[PDB]
RNA sequence: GACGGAAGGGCACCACCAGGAGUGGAGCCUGCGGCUUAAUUUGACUCAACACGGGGAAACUCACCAGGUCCAGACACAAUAA
RNA sequence: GACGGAGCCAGCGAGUACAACCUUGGCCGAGAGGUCUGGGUAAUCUUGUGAAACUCCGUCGUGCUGGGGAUAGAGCAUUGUAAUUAUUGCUCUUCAACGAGGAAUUCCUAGUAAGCGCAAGUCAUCAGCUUGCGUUGAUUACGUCCCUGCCCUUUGUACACACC
């Protein structure tokens, strides 16, 4: 409820936020994925990226 | 969506992945295997694979409907635009995820690990594939943790003989 | 030797409008002034004024302690005891010449400035 | 291009604006030796004067030199605005100045003194003998005094 | 958590209407979709409801996945009084 | 009863090539059966979506990189054809994977 | 209209395209003569095929080369290749087999591509090194 | 099995020859270690740590230090209680 | 070689919605960067990414000198609620160490080495970084086990925490 609990979280690490764990380190924003690297590694074959070259 | 084609495709892929994850989380007892997303301009179809179909359905159509509702809520879809179809896999002993789930269930009930693994291997053999291997890592009722191999038939490891001809599932079991 | 702030002499600036000072200032300062005015230094100026009032007028005011190292002073202050926060410690600073338009953080050195080697 | 051989008229090594100006450097680049005078701006000054750049240091007649000096010391009148000179805007007069030879250093010293008086971070750093403009002293500046 | 009672009631009503609730782990934020309330409160309410059976919960991709059992539904109805034969979507209406 | 020629572009999008090929074949067959003016399935520069990522989840170890790539196939078709019937045609036959997009203009 | 042959030239990624027609004696790079190309030194490289064959074999020709890609040297090489290829194509179409053979012989006393397109294409730059084969710099301790 | 300043037989430009190109020298740049500090958060220490944690951090990040809020303590039962 | 002009040529990318992207073209400013407009949520528009390095005409000419641009001043913008402990950028002036680098050691055998850029990743703003392209394009091997390892075979081991 507090109108003093949050300052601007506009960019960098604020709005630039994870879409799996809730982390902030290693954020591939390419094609608007917003996934962490490690998670992506174990999921990319389902999202559709592979090891062709 | 109106967004770029490439981006749209990526988003769809991500959505699919998310769906898969959800199914893995939720449909443990329901015996989940795999998901497909078919998109027609008016109707979005998701085909779910499972072993205990009645459970997936609910009563008359309890659980599937709720899942559809959830899906609608999540990625913003108008009620009726999305649909679900839960259907059997004709060979349960080929889809790796299903096998993994079965193994997990065996473990949580209180079975011996080795025995369970052997049972799973036997089941796979009965189903009919050109060999399978089971890897069980961690504590095997010991303070020091080890690795296990339960191999039958013959395996492949490198190439495009991997993809399509192989199914791989990693599933972790939490215990006391 | 007296002092000229930016052309305009010492005495005239102790009671002088802010806008004029901004106009006759570095570009960064101008930009700062442009960007945000309402409810941005809250009432730092007001506090300073109050402090000035409470003083015997010939004496320097009571210490006003700010966490704002970011603050650039306007020439309406000057001769005001602004305690600047250095993470833990309040640093006392007195201003007479053109530290006006310069950040308060510059005068309270944050890191404790070295001992090192003893050789 | 000049076919002119020139007789004994040019005297090398000139004493101009107190600091010694050396011989046969190309006018602009002869002037650069003086502090406050720098390449591009020297060239500009020369252009303003209306002396051909492709000449010797000793070649310059006295009048031309005088003109150049005038241009340097009083810059604003000869169409040289802000993106031009040394102390733009300035802290002491409001007018901009193209400080020279033994002035710029003095100004710098004065600034340092003022900083010291008013105990600012930069001033403190200068007093110490440390690097100011965003440098990591983990490796930077091991030459000392 | 202590939620303004009316808001809580509204949330409950919405849940009943749906049979499905989301609200991501996006705390502090102004407002949830569909229901015009602060999200944290909603989440807490949901958790409370779950604590005794009632609702289901999954944390997947920070989403929260809230659906009620029939007993839970009954309890919800009791909480908000509401006459017989008012349906979520567990009771089938359409054709597929 | 309408009978009005549209002059319409139809774009396909697919991560899978075989499915796309099948769809193209289907479209060609449709064109043949109804006898319609077309520009034959035109290929595009296939956008390869490269995500360069260190394989290590901790960083401690040797510098190993993996470029996880997704080759995306476009392929479009241009149909100079009538109205309602054409619309009906350009809706049916769906393969899993490939996305069909029909635009507008009359 | 008079039949005319289209040819191309490749090196690295540079693409030349020559158009050989029947006419007066044109030899053109984009919109300019071979007397220009670019680097002045490498003017002889593009002129070389002509020198080899005989300049009289051009008294009835029109040549125009559209060149895109590469850098400069590569472009020049591509142009040269295209010209050679253009000539051979023309011979194939309009002239005689013995003539073609002669042309080939003249070229193959050098074989700086000319009639045969070059292999040797850029190798991908791998990770853990600035170059394709070049590894980084091993530090140890 | 390992190991041998053992023996044969083979290999390799993280081996060398025949050579490049340099770094190590200079300044800077970034990362360490070491010292300092309220804190300089940390994990890496032969390749296989040291432009590595995607780590090009002004808040965020975030972990550290100095301060100030907040309950996000479900639920159970006791008491409080209109 | 640097410094001026003037020639002129690339390939990967990436880029707008339920937000504030890549930005052209025309006027501002001497730069950066503003500004009204449109194009482009993609082979189309930015972008032929007219990219450097190079190419030609000059100017300078064995000089810590126009080589080097660190360090310092002072000023104008930009991003951001917030730039001081220069965020960056641009103009200025300031011109140090540095005459090809000890013992040492890395990397490389063909479109490779190196030079040279660019785009992307990070990103609100910033590349000296990585990751991928593409221009320019050599020299010398095609071999041996001497040093450093590795592989198997035999051999000897008072060693299996296995020569640390
Ligand atoms: Mg095999
Ligand atoms: Mg193989
Ligand atoms: Mg190794
Ligand atoms: Mg980095
Ligand atoms: Mg220079
Ligand atoms: Mg240079
Ligand atoms: Mg191109
Ligand atoms: Mg010099
Ligand atoms: Mg920074
Ligand atoms: Mg020993």
UniProtKB/Swiss-Prot annotation, chain A:
Pfam family, one: Ribosomal_S14
Gene Ontology biological-process entries: cytoplasmic translation
Cellular component terms per the entry's GO annotation: cytosolic small ribosomal subunit
Statement: the UniProt record of this protein carries the keyword Transmembrane: no
Molecular function terms from GO: structural constituent of ribosome; zinc ion binding
Domain of life: Eukaryota
Annotated InterPro entries: Ribosomal_uS14 (IPR001209), RIbosomal_uS14_euk_arc (IPR039744), Ribosomal_uS14_sf (IPR043140)
Annotated keywords: Ribonucleoprotein, Ribosomal protein
Family: Belongs to the universal ribosomal protein uS14 family.
Name of the featured protein: Small ribosomal subunit protein uS14
Gene: RPS29
Curated annotation (Swiss-Prot), chain G:
Keyword Ribonucleoprotein in annotation: yes
Disulphide bonds in the chain: none
Pfam families xrefs: Ribosomal_S9 (PF00380)
One Gene Ontology MF term: RNA binding
Span list, region Disordered: 121-141
Keywords linked to the UniProt accession: Ribonucleoprotein, Ribosomal protein
Keyword Secreted: no
Superkingdom classification of source: Eukaryota
Ranges of compositional bias, category Basic residues: 132-141
Protein name from the UniProt record: Small ribosomal subunit protein uS9
Source organism: Kluyveromyces lactis (strain ATCC 8585 / CBS 2359 / DSM 70799 / NBRC 1267 / NRRL Y-1140 / WM37) (Yeast)
Lineage: Eukaryota, Fungi, Dikarya, Ascomycota, Saccharomycotina
């Amino acid at each position: 409820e507090n109108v003093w609990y949050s300052h601007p979280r506009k960019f960098g690490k604020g709005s630039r936020q994870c879409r799996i764990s809730g982390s902030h380190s290693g954020l591939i924003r390419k094609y608007g994925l917003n996934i962490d690297r490690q998670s992506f590694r174990e999921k990319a074959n389902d999202i559709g990226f592979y090891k062709y070259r | 969506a109106i967004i770029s084609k490439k981006r749209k495709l990526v988003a769809d892929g991500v959505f699919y992945a998310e769906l898969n994850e959800f199914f893995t989380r939720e449909l443990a007892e329901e015996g989940y295997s795999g998901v497909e997303v078919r998109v027609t301009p008016t109707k979005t179809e998701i085909i779910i694979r499972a072993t205990k179909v009645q459970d997936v359905v609910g009563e008359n159509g309890r659980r599937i409907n709720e899942l559809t509702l959830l899906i609608e809520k999540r990625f913003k879809y108008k009620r009726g635009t999305i649909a679900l179809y839960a259907e059997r896999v004709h060979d349960r002993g080929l889809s790796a995820v299903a096998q993994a789930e079965s193994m997990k269930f065996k473990l949580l009930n209180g079975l011996a690990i080795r025995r369970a693994a052997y049972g799973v291997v036997r089941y796979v053999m009965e189903s009919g594939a050109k060999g399978c291997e089971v890897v069980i890592s961690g504590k095997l009722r010991a303070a020091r943790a080890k690795s296990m191999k339960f191999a039958d038939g013959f395996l492949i490891h490198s190439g495009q003989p991997v993809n399509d001809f192989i199914e791989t599932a990693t599933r972790h079991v939490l215990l006391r | 030797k007296t002092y000229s702030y930016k052309g305009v002499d010492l005495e005239k600036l102790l009671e002088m409008p802010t806008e004029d000072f901004v106009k006759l200032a570095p570009a960064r300062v101008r930009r700062k002034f442009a960007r945000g005015l309402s409810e941005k230094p809250a009432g730092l100026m007001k506090k300073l004024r109050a402090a000035k009032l409470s003083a015997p007028e010939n004496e320097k005011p009571a210490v006003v302690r700010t966490h704002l190292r970011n603050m650039i002073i306007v020439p309406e202050m000057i001769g005001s005891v602004v305690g600047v926060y250095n993470g833990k410690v309040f640093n006392q600073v007195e201003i007479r010449p053109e530290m006006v338009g310069h950040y308060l953080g510059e005068f309270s050195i944050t890191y404790t400035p070295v001992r090192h080697g003893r050789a | 291009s000049l076919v002119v051989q020139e007789q004994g008229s040019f005297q090398h090594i000139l004493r101009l604006l107190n600091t010694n100006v050396d011989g046969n450097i190309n006018v602009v680049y002869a002037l650069t030796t003086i502090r406050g005078v720098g390449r591009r701006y020297a060239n500009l000054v020369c252009k303003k004067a209306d002396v051909d750049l492709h000449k010797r240091a000793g070649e310059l007649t006295q009048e031309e030199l005088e003109r150049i000096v005038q241009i340097m010391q009083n810059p604003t009148h000869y169409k040289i605005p802000a993106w031009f000179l040394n102390r733009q805007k300035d802290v002491n007069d409001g007018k901009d100045y193209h400080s020279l030879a033994n002035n710029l250093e003095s100004k710098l010293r004065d600034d340092l003194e003022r900083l010291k008086k008013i105990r600012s971070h930069r001033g403190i750093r200068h007093f110490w003998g440390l690097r100011v403009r965003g440098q990591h002293t983990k490796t930077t500046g091991r030459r000392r005094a | 958590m202590l939620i303004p009672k009316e808001d809580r009631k509204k949330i409950y009503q919405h849940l009943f209407q749906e049979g499905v609730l989301v609200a991501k782990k996006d705390f502090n934020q102004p407002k949830h979709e569909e229901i015009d309330t602060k999200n944290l409160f909603v989440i807490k309410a949901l958790q409370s409801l779950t604590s005794k059976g009632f609702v289901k919960t999954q944390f997947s991709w920070q989403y929260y996945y809230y659906t009620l059992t029939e007993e839970g539904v009954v309890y919800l109805r009791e909480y908000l009084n509401l006459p017989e034969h008012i349906f979520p979507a567990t009771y089938l209406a359409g054709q597929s | 009863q309408e009978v009005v020629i549209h002059k319409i572009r139809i774009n396909l999008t697919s991560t899978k090539v075989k499915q796309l090929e099948n769809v193209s074949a289907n479209i060609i067959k449709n064109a043949e059966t109804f006898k319609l003016v077309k520009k034959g399935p035109v290929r595009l520069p296939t956008k390869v979506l490269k995500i360069s990522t260190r394989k290590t989840p901790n960083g401690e170890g040797s510098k190993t990189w993996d470029t996880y790539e997704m080759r995306i196939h476009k392929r479009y078709i241009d149909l100079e054809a009538p109205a309602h019937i054409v619309k009906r045609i350009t809706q049916i036959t769906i393969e899993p994977g490939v996305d069909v997009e029909v635009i507008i203009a009359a | 209209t008079v039949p005319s042959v289209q040819t191309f030239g490749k090196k690295k990624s540079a693409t030349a395209v020559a158009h050989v027609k029947a006419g007066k004696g044109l030899i053109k790079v984009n919109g300019s003569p071979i007397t220009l190309v670019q680097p002045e030194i490498l003017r002889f490289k593009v002129y070389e095929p002509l020198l080899l064959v005989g300049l009289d074999k051009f008294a009835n020709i029109d040549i125009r080369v559209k060149v895109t890609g590469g850098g400069h040297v590569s472009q020049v090489y591509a142009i040269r290749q295209a010209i050679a290829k253009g000539l051979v194509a023309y011979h194939q179409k309009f002239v005689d087999e013995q003539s073609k053979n002669e042309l080939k012989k003249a070229f193959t006393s050098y074989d700086r591509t000319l009639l045969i397109a070059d292999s040797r294409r850029p190798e991908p730059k791998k990770f853990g090194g600035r170059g394709a084969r070049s590894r980084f710099q091993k530090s140890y301790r």
